[PDB]
Each structure stands twice: as C-alpha cells, then as structure tokens.
Amino acid sequence: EGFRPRTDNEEKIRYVVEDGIFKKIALRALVKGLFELEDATIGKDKIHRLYILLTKKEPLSPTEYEEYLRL
Amino acid sequence: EGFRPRTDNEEKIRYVVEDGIFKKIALRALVKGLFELEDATIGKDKIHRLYILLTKKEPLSPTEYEEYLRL
Amino acid sequence: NIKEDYFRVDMLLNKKGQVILYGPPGTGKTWIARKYVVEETNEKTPGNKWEFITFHQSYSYEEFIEGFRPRTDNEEKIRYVVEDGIFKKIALRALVKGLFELEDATIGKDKIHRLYILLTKKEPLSPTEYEEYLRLKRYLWELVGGLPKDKLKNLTPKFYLIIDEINRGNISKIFGELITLLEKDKRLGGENQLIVRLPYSGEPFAVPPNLYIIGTMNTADRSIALLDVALRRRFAFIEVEPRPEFLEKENLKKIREKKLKTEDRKRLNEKLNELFSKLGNDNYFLKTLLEKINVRITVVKDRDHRIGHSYFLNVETVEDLHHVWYYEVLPLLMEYFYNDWETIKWVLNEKGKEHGNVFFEKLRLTGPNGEEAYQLKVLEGDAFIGALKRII
Amino acid sequence: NIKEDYFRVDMLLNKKGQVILYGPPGTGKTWIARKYVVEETNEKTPGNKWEFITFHQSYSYEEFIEGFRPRTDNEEKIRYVVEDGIFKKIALRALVKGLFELEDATIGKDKIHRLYILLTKKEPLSPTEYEEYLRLKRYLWELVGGLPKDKLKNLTPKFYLIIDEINRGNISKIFGELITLLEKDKRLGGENQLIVRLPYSGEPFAVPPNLYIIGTMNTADRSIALLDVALRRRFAFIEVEPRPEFLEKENLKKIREKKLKTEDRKRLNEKLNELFSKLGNDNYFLKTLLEKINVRITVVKDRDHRIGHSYFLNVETVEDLHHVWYYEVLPLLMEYFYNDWETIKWVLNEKGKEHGNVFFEKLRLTGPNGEEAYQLKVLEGDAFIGALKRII
Amino acid sequence: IKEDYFRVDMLLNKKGQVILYGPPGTGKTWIARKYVVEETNEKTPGNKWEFITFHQSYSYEEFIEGFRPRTDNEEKIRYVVEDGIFKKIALRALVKGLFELEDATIGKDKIHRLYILLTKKEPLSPTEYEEYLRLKRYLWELVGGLPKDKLKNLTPKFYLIIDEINRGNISKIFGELITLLEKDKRLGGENQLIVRLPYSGEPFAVPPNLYIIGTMNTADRSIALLDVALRRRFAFIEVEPRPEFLEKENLKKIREKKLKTEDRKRLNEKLNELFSKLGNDNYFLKTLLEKINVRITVVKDRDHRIGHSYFLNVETVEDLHHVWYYEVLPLLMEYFYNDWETIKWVLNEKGKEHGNVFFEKLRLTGPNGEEAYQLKVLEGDAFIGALKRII
Amino acid sequence: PPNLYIIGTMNTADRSIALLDVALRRRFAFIEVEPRPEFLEKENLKKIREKKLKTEDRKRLNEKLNELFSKL
Amino acid sequence: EGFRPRTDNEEKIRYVVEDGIFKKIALRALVKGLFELEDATIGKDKIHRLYILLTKKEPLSPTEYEEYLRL
Amino acid sequence: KGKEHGNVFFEKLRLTGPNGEEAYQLKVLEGDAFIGALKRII
Amino acid sequence: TTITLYEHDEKRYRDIAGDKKAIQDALIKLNKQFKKDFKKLDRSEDNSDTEDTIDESKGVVEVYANKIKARHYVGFAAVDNVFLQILPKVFKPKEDTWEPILAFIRMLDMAYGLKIKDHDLAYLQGRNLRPNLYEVFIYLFAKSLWSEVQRGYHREYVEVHREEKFLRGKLLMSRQIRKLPHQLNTFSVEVHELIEDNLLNRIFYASVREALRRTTWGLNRKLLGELMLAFDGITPIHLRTEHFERVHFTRLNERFRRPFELAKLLFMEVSGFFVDMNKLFERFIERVLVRNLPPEYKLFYQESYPFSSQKPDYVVRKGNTPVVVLDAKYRELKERIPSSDMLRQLYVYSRIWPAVIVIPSSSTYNQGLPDKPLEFEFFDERKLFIVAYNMDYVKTGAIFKADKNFRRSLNNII
Ligand SMILES: Nc1nc2c(ncn2[C@@H]2O[C@H](COP(=O)(O)OP(=O)(O)OP(O)(O)=S)[C@@H](O)[C@H]2O)c(=O)[nH]1
Ligand SMILES: Nc1nc2c(ncn2[C@@H]2O[C@H](COP(=O)(O)OP(=O)(O)OP(O)(O)=S)[C@@H](O)[C@H]2O)c(=O)[nH]1
Ligand SMILES: Nc1nc2c(ncn2[C@@H]2O[C@H](COP(=O)(O)OP(=O)(O)O)[C@@H](O)[C@H]2O)c(=O)[nH]1
Ligand SMILES: [Mg+2]
Ligand SMILES: [Mg+2]
Ligand SMILES: [Mg+2]
C-alpha cells in the first residue's frame, strides 16, 4: 500500500492511496474464496462486485473508487 | 513517464503525463510495426496519425494533446 | 503444566511492569504471550485492549511513538500532520480508558470519552477531527499533571502490547522515550512520575500504569549483545525453555485433542499410534530425540540455539516427521553451525560415519588442498528411522 | 537524601552550569536528577519551571533548538516554517521569565509578558501570531544587547532541563550551537557574553544563566559513551557508584518507608524482619551480596558494568528475591559472560562446584574437541539461600 | 598578554583567515572574542561582526545561499533563494567598504540603499525585496568596473568569527568559498575572482574586509581539518594549554581583572588561603598542570592535553577538590577506559597501590590472573599529599 | 487469507540461504532446485525440444543432434 | 538543467525549468558562435534575440521565457 | 633524526612512557637561531 | 597434518604424519610466498642473500631429500592443511609443547609491540588443547574482539541524503523547495543515522568468516560462532589490502585497535606471518636495556658509517661521552668464546664509536649457559673491553626474576 498521484480531469495533483501487488492479490484471494462459502451468501452480490473491480485495470474515476473503498 | 506542467490557460495550469524517452521509443516502434501490418487494417489511417505525433520533435500542443491521448 | 507459565508471566508483569520471553525459536514464545493476553483480557482480536506488533530491521522510532508523516486530507492534496505511532495510539488509549473509572471532581468525562472515540477510530484522522484530536489531547495532559499520585495507580483496564521479535529491531532507537519511562516507578502514578516532552509533536507524554509491554525475543538471531543497560534492566527476562516433555505419546495426544473436535481426536489417536509403532513402540521417542539433540547443541554452541518443540508438535505419521526434519530442523541446523560438517555430524553422533544411512555423506572427490565437502542426503522409510534411532 | 548526592549536585551545578550523572545502570541517576529538580522548583510535573526530555538516535538537531519543520496550515497544506525546538523554548522561557524583574526593559515590559505568553502557549502557533512571536523574539535580542553584564548575573528563577540518557543521541550534532554556549562564563551575564547567530531563522541566540542542564548518561555501553573531549569540559561529571549500603536492614526500612508514608509501615517492617530472619538474621546480607558481585565484576569486566542497587531495592520476601534473581540479574549475568562459563561460575563463587546446591550444573556430556558447557538450575527454598550464602 | 592578540592581528593581514587550533581548555574562543571586541569596539554581535559556530547540520544552503520559503504576507508563500549567514556578511562588508571611496564606485545613493536593506533586522517585504535583488545585481555590475587600487583598501574591518570549524563538514559548508579564501583571490587582490553561485546564479566575491577567525579543537581527531587545500588558505595559530596562568600571582592578575575592588579583597584572602594549604608555594598549579600535560603528551598524543580552563576558576582547596574528581579525573578515565596501568602512570603512582592513592587496588584477583583498581575519593589534607606526589 | 501461497525464487550465487534476513529462513520453507544434468542426454535433449517445435522441425532437430553427438 | 519554482509578483507557483550554469555557457557559446557567420543561419535578428535572452541578469518573465523556449 | 635538543623545532621530552614510547614538542625559535635550525635542513 | 619445527632443527619424513609428497608440496608454495613478501619485514645482520637463497625454495624452510630443516625465521604458516609452526630454539625443552608457545608469544608481546593481555594467555594454560600458533592468534583476535564487541558494537555515523517516507534529521530545503507537487509525498532529508555495517565492521565480519573456516579448536569455533551471529546483518566483503588501509583510527573506534592489528597480522592461499629471530631478540633486548639502564640513556639503531654503513644493534650513552656498544646476537656462542664473524664485528663497533662493548646472548636449558656474573672479559690488543653478558629467560613463566639478575650484572659492567 502506498501513496500515488492522480489527476482529476486535468486539474492539480490529487494524492490517492493505491494498493500494491500483495494487497491486490490477498484481497483478491479473499473475495474469490467467499463465493463458495455458504455463510458469505448474505452479501454475495456486493462481494462479486468487488471481485470484478479488483481484477480490472486502471480505475479511471473516483466514483468507482469510493465504491471500491466502501465495498 | 511522469507529471509535467504545461502552457495551458493562464489560471488553468494543468499537470499532464508527459511521456519520457523509453515509452516514446517503444510506442514509436509499435506504431511503425503496426503501420506495415496486414491484419491491423481496422484503423491504419489513424496509426499513421499516431506516428506523426511520436516523431514530433517539440513539446505537444495542449489543443491536440487529447488527440495524442485518444490515439 | 502451562498455567504456571501463565503465572510466571503474571507474577513478573505486576512487579516489573513488562517482560521479555526470550528463548530459541520454535518454542511457543509468541503463543504463550498471545494466549496469556487473550486469557486475561477476553479479546481474541487486536485493537481495543491489546495490539500485536512485530519489529523488523528497518523499523524506526517514527512508526512507534510519533513522526512527521504525509497524510491525505479528504481526497485532496497532502498535508504534513504528525501521526502518532502504534505505541502512542495505545499508551494514550490505556490512559483515557482507565480515566473512565476514576471518580474525581476534575475529570472531563464528556471530553475524555470524545478523546477515546478518536483514539479507537480505525479509520485515519480527517483534518476536521484531527484538530479536535490534538485539542482534546492537550486537555488530557493538562489534566494528568493536576491529578495526584494517589488516584493514578488504581486504573482498572489492563492494556497489553505484544512486541514480537523485540531484538530484531534496534531496541534503543525504537524506545526513544521508553528507556526512561518503562520502569514501574517511572510510569504515571508511581513514586517517580515522569511526563516526558516529545521532540516531534511537542506535547508531553507518559506511559500509564495499565500498559504492559510483553516481548517475544528470538535469540538465535541478533544475539545476547543487547543494550545491556536500558533495554535489559526494565524488562524482566523470562526464559522459555524448549521443552521436550510435550513430545511424548500422551502429551502429543493431549495437545492435539483439546483444540480438536469429536471426529478429529479419534483419528489423531489412530495416526499417533501408527507413528510411534513405526518408531519401535517407544512412547518416549520424540522426547528422547529432542532432549538428546538439545544436549549436543548446548555443548558445542550456545544454550540458546537449541531446536524448539513447535516443529514436532504437529506430526501424525512418519512422512510428516520426515518433512519437519529435512525442512525445519536440518536447514535450521545448518544455519547455526555456519555450513560446518565435522561438528554438525557429532550432534547426530555420526562423526565416524559416511556414505551409509547418514544425513551428511562425504563426496568421494576431495579438493586440491585436501579439503572435503559433505552433502545432505534424503532418506525414506525404515532407513530414515534407523538414522533417527542412532541419535539416541 | 540531602547528605551527599543532593548537596554535591547543587554545589556543582551552581558552579559549572551543567551536570552529567554518569554511572552504571541500577543506580539513582535519573532518580537523583528527578528528586533534586522537584525539591528545588517545587513543581512535581514538567511544564513551566522544568522540562524532562530524553535523547535517542532518532533525535534531531532540527528538533532540539532550531529547524525547518513543515506545518499544516488551512489553505496551504505544505507550508515550511522554522520551528524552535525544546531547548530554544526553554532558553527563551528562562530568559523572558527572568527579565520580569529588570530595570532596563522599561519600554517593553508588556512586550516581554506577551512573549512569555507565546512561549508558555501549548497550543500550536497560528501564522497570524507567529509573526508577532518573531517580532517579539528579535525585540528580545535587541534588548539584551543593551543590557549590562552586571544586571544579567542574577536572574531570580532557576529553570532546569533534565535530559536523560544524554549519551545516546549524537551529542556533537544535537548540541550544535550549544558546544560553545554551555559554560558558566559563556552564558548571558558571564565574563564572555556570547550571542551566536543561528542558521535557519537568522535570529541571534544565547543561553541564559537561568538555565541548568542535568544530563544522566549511561556508561555500561561503550559505543555511545561521551568521548568528546571538547564537550566533557562543558559538563561536570558526577560518578554515582552503585552503593550496596542501601540494601542493609535499617536502610531498606528507611528508603521504602520514606516514600510510602501510608499506614503500611507496620506491614513493611514485619515483612522485612521476616525476610532477613530467613537469611540467617544477617542485617548486612544484601549489602554483602551486591558488594561481593560488583567487586567480582570489576576485576574481570569493566568497572562500569556493575550491578546497580535498583534490582535488590524492591525486594520484600525470599519469593521476591527468587524472582529478582532468576529473571533480572541472572539473565543479566549470562549476558555479560555469554558462554564464558568459567567466569560466571567464578563471579558467583561456585568455581570448584559442579553439582548440588549450585546455580549452574555441569553437563555430564563433553564435546568432540574437548569443549564443555553448563546448564542453569532453578533452585528454590532454603537450598536457594544455601546457594546465595556461598557468594558472600 | 598582547602577544597572542598581536599574533592574530599579524596573520589576519597576511593570509586573511586565522585558525586558533589547540587542545580543549585553553584560550581559543576567548582570545578570538577578545580580539574582535577590542578591534571593533562592539561588545555584541551585529553589523560589524557576527559569531557563528559549526556543526554537522550546518549545511551549505543556510551558510552561503539556498532556497528558503518566505512571504511576509500570511499568503502566497514565495519560494525564493535567500542568502545565508556568510553572504549576508560579505555583501555587507562590501557595501560598507563602498562608502569611503571618492569617485570610483559611483553608487552613493544606490549603495547606501543596499546597506540599509542588508542591516535591516526585520525580514524583507516583497515590495522592498525586489529592490534588494535589483541593487545587488547593480553591485556586481559596479564591482568589476572599479580599479584594484580603489578596491584593495576598504576601510572598515569586518569579522566572521566562527567556532568549531572542524566540527562541521567544512568542505561542504565552504562551497564557492573554497577558492576565495586567499588574500590575493578576494576583491582588490592581484587575481580577483567574481565566481558564480549555483542557486541564485548571481555572481559573488569576498571583499578584503572580511576576516574569518575560526577556533577549533584538535583532541577529536575524528573530525580534524586534514583537507590539505583548506590548510593552505588558513593560518594556523598554535594555542597550547599554557600553565603559566596557574601561578599565585598570575591567577591573582587574571581573576581580579573585573571586580572593582569590592570582592577583590575577598578573592585576595581566598587565594592566600588556598596556597597556604598547598605548602606555601606560589608555583603549585603551574607545575601540576605541567607534569600532567607532559605525562599526557608522551602517552596519548600532543593534542589531548589538559587545558587551563579547569583549574583557572579555583578559589579554595575545596574548589580544587571539586574540579579534580569531577572534571579532569573523569576526563582522565575516559582517555584510558579500562587501561589501568597507564592511568596510574599519569598520576605517577605506578608503584603505589594502597594508602593515599586515587586508584586503590582491589583485594580480589582474577581467575585468569587479572586485576582492576577502584577509584578512592580522598578528602582533607590527605588529598594534597596524594596530589603533591604527582610533582 | 489461506489461499495466497508465496512461491519465492532465489538466485543464490551471490547471497546464500544463511545470508538472508532472519524473518525469511523461518517463515518460508526452502526447496533446493538442484542443477540436473540428466536433461542433457541424447534422448532427453530430443524430448525437451520436441515440445516447442513442430513435426518437420523435429526431423531437422533430430538430424542436428545426431550431427552434434557424432562430432563429440 | 533542473526544475525550479518561480512566483514573480502575484501569480501561482509555475514550475519553470531553469537551465544551470553549463547550459547558460553552452547555449551562449553556440549563439555567439552562429552570430558571426552567415551560411544558412537565417534570422540573424532571431539569433540576436536569443543572445539577449541568455545574458539577462534579471530572471526571465513568463512573457519572455516562452519566446526564449521557442527560439 | 639525531638532533633532540638545542636549535631544533622539536625538543625531546625528558621522560619516556611506561612501555617505551616517547613524544616531542614544537619549540618556537626566533632570529638567527631559527635560521640555524633551517639551514641544517638543506 | 600438524608439523612443528624449532630454529635450526630437523624432522624425518618417515616418522612424520600425513603423506611424504603432501608436505613437500606445501613448503614450495610457502618458500615462494615468502619470496614475494620478503621485503616487508626488517632484518638485523641476517645474511639473507635475497637474490639466490630465498628463491631456491630455502626462504623459510629448507626442504631436503631425506629431512626437513628450519632456517632462523620464527613464526608460523598454514598452507594446504599442513600447518607449520617454527618456535625459537631457546625455548626448546629437554602440555609438553605448551610452555614454548606462551614463551614465544610473550617474547612476541614485548619485542614486536603488541598490546595483548597476560590473562588472555593464562586462560589457555592447562586446558589440554592442541598446541598451535594459528589456533591461539585466532583466539587472541576473537577474544579481544568479543571483549570489545560485548561493550559496544561500533555503530559509526554516516550522513545520507535519502528520500524518506518519514522525517528524520535535518530536512534538506533546496531539494524540497524544487520538488514538484506530483512527488511531494516523500520528504527529502539529510539524516546522520548510525550504521552498524561500517567499514571496520565489514572487515571484522570478513575476518571472522575467514577464521571460522580455517580454525581447528573447539574453543575458537564457539567464540567465532558467537561473533558471526553478532555481525549477522552486515553485508560481507572480500578482504584485500586496500580495506585494511582505508580505515583510520580516531577516538571513537580506538578501542578496536587491538583486534584490528591482529586481524591485519593474520589476514590481507597463505596465512600467518614470519619474522627474523635475530631482530626479534634485537627488539626484545631493547625493552630490557632501557628499563634496566637508568644511569645512561640507550638508543637502538644508531649508525656510524665506515669508509656501506655498519651499525650497532644498540648503543648506550649518558649524554654523549660514554660509548658502550651493545650488539645483540642470537648465536649460541659455543666453547665460551665468540666466533670469527661475531668478534670481527665487535672490533669495528668499538673502534668507530676507548669504547667498551657488551654482547647479550640467550641462556636457557637448551642454549649454552655460562656462569651467573659477566662471563667473559676480552681485550683485542687495543685496550678494548669485550664483555659477554647473558640474559636468563624466565619469560617461559610470567615473573621477571632474571631482569634483576641482568640489572645486577649490568651494574657491575656500568
Ligand atoms: N529512595 C531511593 N531510591 C533509589 C536510590 N537509588 C536508586 N533508587 C531507586 O532506583 C530506581 C531506578 O533507578 P534509576 O535512577 O531510574 O536508574 P537509571 O539511572 O535510570 O538507570 P539507567 O537505565 O538510566 S542507566 C528508582 O525507583 C529509585 O527509587 C536512592 O538512593 N534512594
Ligand atoms: N584571562 C584569561 N582567561 C582565559 C585564558 N585562557 C582561558 N581563559 C578562560 O577560560 C575559559 C574557557 O576558555 P575557552 O576559550 O572557552 O576554551 P575553548 O577553547 O573555547 O574550549 P573549546 O571547547 O571551544 S575547544 C574562558 O571563559 C576564558 O575566560 C587566558 O589566557 N586569559
Ligand atoms: N497446544 C499447545 N501448542 C503449542 C504450545 N507451545 C507451542 N505450541 C505451538 O507452537 C506454534 C507457535 O510457535 P511460535 O510461538 O510462533 O514459535 P516462535 O515464535 O518462533 O518461537 C503454535 O502452532 C502452537 O500450536 C503449547 O504449550 N500448547
Ligand atoms: Mg515468534
Ligand atoms: Mg535514566
Ligand atoms: Mg569554542
């Protein structure tokens, strides 16, 4: 986990926390493992939303990043 | 690549991602490689437009930097 | 016999204030410290009443007490607000949680409870409430200096701090303000109450009498050349010996059945009866094997380089004993003796043996200047058991 | 208390200006620095009259007197301002508090009171009043340039800075400007008034004669010892030897009932009578035990690695003496002589003994190349006192 | 008396920058402070002289020039390059020297405007800082159009008296100054050098007024000025620890210099009572410091010698006891940490084990045949009999 | 989570296994991948190169390896 | 060559790139070199305009630095 | 190397160390005696 | 195999351990290695003949067809698992070879200038270890290091201009002002941090690693094993001669002078060192004379040039007037008379300095022993006075009884 700069529609530099390699593969191993659990079916829609977001590349806008930090 | 300020509007100084030399030479080798390819003929009239932007021997103009970004 | 080890820690932790469970690795020093705090304050997770924290070689004072750290402010440009570390987020927390139960006519219990919420906040501090955190922290150290020493010894919630691998980090540099404070007398409420002024934030800071900093020092790495004055007088050192008494037939059965379930303990009984029958029907085999190999370690090398007993505590067959002897004992044994061979075979008393059922066989081609190089040799089946039955 | 270690600090600190209480760990160095300042200033907590800070290796020159420290303003988050450290906030505090009773500041006595408010202000300085603070600071060093040396010799408060473990930090770097100010005739009012020019703020600075610095270095470690010969002249070293005379029967009753003046004096006295009656009714046992170890450590180790009298000061019973032996000083003795067994057997005066009532039993298994090592034995009961009576 | 005063005054005109090096405890900062005060008649630092002292955090950016945030408006923090301590002196020593010239530097309205913005204690507002940066560009356009005869003789002598010059990383602090600190490489010299600074880019040259008298200690050999190119610039005055001041008469002449005959009668009978207990000899502390400094020269080095700042402030025999056991014997023990047969020889008690010895012998011995001594706090007239045996 | 396994890879020509950090020789478990010369036979070098190439490249690979070991 | 902040009187901190000592000698030697000959160096007033903007004692204004970057 | 007293920049201290060490001191000369200690270099 | 020699002593190849071919292979490397490193050590009347004798495989050892003979070069060397040690012939006896080891190191203590402790050597006396010079100088290095590492670790300060995620030390301002706001998230400081792996600690990690690999005791393997664990975080280096020169001894690492000089004496193939037995006695007598000659000051190596300069080993003069020449010779002095080569040099040293001359010689059970007083007065038909003095050697013990007998004979000579 670290700090990385990011532009907000061609504006001044906005710092945002972007997860590295190990945390993006440990959280991915968690949200993929919670599919086949019978007790984790209380949030199966929202966990599946996290796994699609965690395997895609370059989250372009903060509207899905705040969705990502909420999930 | 890194972040550089540009000559935008006066009260609207922007931080764009100006590419370095290794990204510019690897894109230029990829653009020139696909320019003479037969199966990449979907947008070959636009790959030659991307080649002129990469051999442009000057800092890129801000009214057409988004044309460089979209290509 | 583990309640005496939960009483040996407990009698020293109220007399000296903090301990260090120093001992060779693979013994249970991390497990004794974690299962004493969970048994004392019933919280299975870190956070509120204790905080697990390990040390490393690049761990610094600014991550422990406080330091200047760049922090984002509500999804915008960074500021440079000074962040309290992992100690100061629990040393202040042990103070304001203890100050709930104190019935004095000067406590701002509405203000202290507001400071307690901002200290247990798992999210980072936003600048709309970080100034509310620093202002309430300023009220705390104006209040602590006004309370007498009679009402700052009986604070009820015992806070803990498992410092894992305390000798791996540079101990005198991490404990900057904590090698003048970590005594039982230099805490708050004691006879020698010291409120030490900090360099970075500039606010005074003092350890409360609730905080007990349990340490789990491995001593096969970064050995007994410690600080020897500051980080040695404050800590009441407890030696956690590698006990081979947990490696009999009944002791392996009793350990692996209490944590087990209904159907697991019958299968663990059938597995262990199959294992010790392949060893020669010796119920005291793994005890005698570990006790014999520990005597050869303490004679040649130091007494704190012995092979522990967390390795052999999770065996169920001969094949699992093979995968713990060739990957958690013999690579550990070649680490201590610095790739030596003529003395690593005396530990197994295979000094006058080569090319047979030996763990280190000599290559049949000597070097130019008469030197010889040995090689680790994998075994299997009854050849490996016959190679273990002559260590005893 | 007032006999030797108080009256030789107060006489020497008033003559030299700075005192370092160098001595081995376990001696009253931090305690005699804390007791002298509290009994002088009549303020049992830090803050106004005195400041207790401690040095470490992460301690900065920029955080001691002056440095660029980035603050967090509202609209400009990254704002680099020059912030005075703790010494410049106690040297300016000792100056403008002493300048309340002078007769040449008759134009700006309100400005000196306003500057004293800004230095006692524990709130962080807003940038609307930081320029008011800097305008009053450069007014102050204009005012002491027009003050005569006959009127700056007697400033009626007495401010203190107890730095603890002074030798741990880079003392040549922390005392940047202070390696030429810290002298009795080189402060303000002395025979050579020196107002040096600080690097960062560009404002002149001079230590007032109001201030005193009581360092307490530790001299068990040697890589952090104070060998700066140009700095050892500025201080005045006081060797506090570890006195075993605080461990007699009458002395333990006089040291432990002076602090605890509650109604448990009948409880401590009957417990200390029972403790020494188990020791053979020897009123000079623990005095002889610490003396016959510190002499036997002085002859083989250095003279500054001796056992202090803070280990055996808090003993109450034989069970408490057993806890302070096997867990505090015997792991300490195994740290001094780490696998040097012929020395550590001799320090406890068990050199010929290898079996029976002894702390270190001899293993009955020698090594390959003729080496042999020993093993601890947890003793208890009257056999433990029979292993302590052999030392004295 | 005036010999060390005149010796500084001679070398500060020949080489340009003197260094008073010596063992710690002698008059190095004192003879440097008394020289600049008696030559400039200014007892506190200010325009005519400035005292600084070096350390490891005294880098190049705050000594000559570097970037420094400064706005003086509580808004619009202007990241501008600000001159350090030295360039605020060398520009001040130049524009003070450009007053007495007749018609060579025709800047009599623009030089005095630059001097009043250089001695201004209040920090520079940006509406007047643009005037200060524009007049400084006029200065190095002025200097360069002046003849060397009207630039060598600038009248008012400025001093940057620095201290512990060895303690800072001197080759890093001296940046562009590493080639300008000769007497003939200044302004007005035979080979003037208008050298260029990195950060601001404005050129720079030291005026011939500015003299750098820098005191250092040479007992720390870890940090000594061993650069052989910063020993050519400086003139190194030997300041040895002189025990001539520790007589009865020479101690009475020094310690009764500023007392106005009020406590001088108290001091006269106090020194009469000190030397009556030492054996009625006026020459005790002279040969006590001599027989220690000679015995510490043949053992450690020439540079670790005990100074004469320790014994200079004694009044009675009790104050000599508190400066022996607390300032110099802890100093003598940390030269020779656990080196006991050497520190016994500095006090020449080498055959003396017990009795009136500072280091009594422990009655124990070692298992391998070793021994170690123990410090013995002596009091009364037995202390003097343990001290007179050194002589 | 207990899914994430950390398969390291260590070129130990420069740094030996004893010259690692102390929280690496005990958290991890070391497998020595020994240099096997048995992959360089006449039939073993053919089988390894048969997985990457095609059928017509394999006869040229067979003829070149027959030309190689006949010269040796 | 390096980066350098430059706020003139009231503008924002526009991060200009300031040429060091060497480029203000290397460009100054090249422009004074080309000023004496006339083979294909058209725009001798344009080369002279670059030489004036290299010996500026004052720092360059943003209305003059931008034409200095073009020349 | 052989001159230890008289017109020499370094006189010898009269006593040696406890284990065979011996140090000197920088003697300040003046006048023609300084030249006589300087012309013996050449 | 362990082979041991005394000065001018021989061993048979048939009785010797190991192989006949293995020892002669070890020696021809050692005598060749002594050729390239001959000029570093000084001599005194050695008759070395540098051109012919040393390069003919006769530098240290004379390897012959039927035996192995030692020259007069004292010390030790370990080559190809054939550890050679050459003790002086004076300490030869009539634990049986453990007295001459501590005798030779004590003669290597006082003469050569080492500052080892007597309680370092007295720890080994009686522990029935195998006598070996390499096993004790590794121990004298390892004990003096582990007694100087147990107190302090020698963490020395370097300054680094490092970009840190936190703020430690002085913040660099010219590197932080010119920082773009896209990279503002790291401070740029210049912190004076203390590093454990300094150059003196890289050497002592490498000097231990090359010592534990080549040690054979059970005491040094335990002591170097604890030293290597204390130096675990230090990155290792390959030792050279540039590394032992690049460090300088200031006041903050002066206590590491004793292990480093012994680490330079043993490390820099070959291992160990050799010195001439003539000069080592010439240096050892110089410690005895200046201590024992209060009336007259004595200087070693004073030279007077005839006609090619023939210089005495030592001359004592009170002021300048008495000329009492003292030339130290390692010769046995058979038949109670000096030889042709000895007395011819004694005649020149007296004439070019009315000058008496005294020759000190060794004396033990093995060497030739004269009577207790000044044994031989001689006149060379020019009113000369040649006195044959003999120093007895209680240096095998720890007490200096013979120094009083040497002073009493010198007081009758003075
Ligand atoms: N009453 C009394 N208590 C003493 C005396 N000497 C030591 N103590 C006790 O010793 C305890 C700790 O001693 P302390 O002075 O703090 O050691 P220290 O100087 O800090 O040791 P270090 O680690 O810095 S080196 C205190 O609780 C104090 O009560 C004494 O002379 N009188
Ligand atoms: N009158 C007089 N006083 C002296 C003389 N030498 C030293 N002193 C006094 O001794 C005190 C200490 O001398 P000082 O100059 O401060 O030592 P120092 O060389 O600066 O010490 P250092 O750490 O920087 S190395 C001064 O206050 C000074 O008054 C002298 O020759 N005459
Ligand atoms: N049940 C039980 N398990 C133990 C005991 N001691 C150690 N263990 C086991 O040891 C393991 C922990 O080892 P650890 O403390 O991390 O070793 P170390 O920190 O390297 O010294 C756990 O899996 C426990 O199951 C014990 O007394 N009882
Ligand atoms: Mg652990
Ligand atoms: Mg302390
Ligand atoms: Mg000074």
CSV table of N, CA and C and ligand atoms in Angstrom, one decimal, chain C residues 179-181 183 186 194 230 233-234, chain D residues 27 29-31 52 54 163-165 216-218, ligand 5:
chain,number,residue,atom,x,y,z
C,179,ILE,N,13.0,4.2,27.3
C,179,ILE,CA,14.0,3.6,28.2
C,179,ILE,C,14.3,4.6,29.3
C,180,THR,N,13.5,5.6,29.5
C,180,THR,CA,13.4,6.4,30.7
C,180,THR,C,12.0,6.2,31.4
C,181,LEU,N,11.1,5.6,30.7
C,181,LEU,CA,9.7,5.6,31.2
C,181,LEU,C,9.2,4.2,31.5
C,183,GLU,N,10.0,1.8,33.3
C,183,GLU,CA,10.1,1.2,34.7
C,183,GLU,C,8.7,1.2,35.3
C,186,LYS,N,8.6,4.8,36.9
C,186,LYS,CA,8.6,6.0,36.1
C,186,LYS,C,7.3,6.1,35.3
C,194,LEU,N,7.2,10.6,35.6
C,194,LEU,CA,7.9,11.5,34.6
C,194,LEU,C,7.0,11.6,33.4
C,230,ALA,N,19.8,-0.2,29.4
C,230,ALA,CA,18.5,0.4,29.3
C,230,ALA,C,17.4,-0.7,28.9
C,233,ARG,N,17.5,-3.7,32.0
C,233,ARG,CA,17.1,-3.5,33.4
C,233,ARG,C,15.6,-3.4,33.4
C,234,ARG,N,14.9,-2.7,32.5
C,234,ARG,CA,13.5,-2.5,32.5
C,234,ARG,C,12.7,-3.8,32.3
D,27,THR,N,21.5,2.5,39.3
D,27,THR,CA,21.9,3.4,40.3
D,27,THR,C,21.0,4.6,40.2
D,29,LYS,N,20.5,7.7,39.2
D,29,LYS,CA,20.9,8.8,38.4
D,29,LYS,C,19.7,9.6,37.8
D,30,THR,N,18.8,8.9,37.2
D,30,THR,CA,17.5,9.5,36.8
D,30,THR,C,16.7,9.9,38.1
D,31,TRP,N,16.8,9.2,39.1
D,31,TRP,CA,16.1,9.5,40.4
D,31,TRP,C,16.7,10.7,41.1
D,52,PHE,N,11.6,17.7,31.3
D,52,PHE,CA,12.2,16.4,31.3
D,52,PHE,C,12.1,15.8,29.8
D,54,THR,N,14.3,13.3,26.9
D,54,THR,CA,15.3,12.3,26.8
D,54,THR,C,15.8,12.1,25.4
D,163,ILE,N,17.9,16.4,30.7
D,163,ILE,CA,18.0,15.5,29.6
D,163,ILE,C,18.4,14.1,30.2
D,164,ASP,N,17.7,13.1,29.7
D,164,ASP,CA,18.0,11.7,30.3
D,164,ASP,C,18.6,10.9,29.1
D,165,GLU,N,19.6,10.1,29.5
D,165,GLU,CA,20.4,9.3,28.5
D,165,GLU,C,20.9,10.3,27.4
D,216,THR,N,21.9,12.7,32.5
D,216,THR,CA,22.1,11.4,33.1
D,216,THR,C,22.5,10.4,32.0
D,217,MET,N,23.8,10.3,31.7
D,217,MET,CA,24.2,9.4,30.7
D,217,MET,C,24.4,8.0,31.3
D,218,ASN,N,24.4,7.0,30.5
D,218,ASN,CA,24.7,5.6,30.9
D,218,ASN,C,26.0,5.2,30.3
J,5,MG,MG,17.7,7.2,33.0
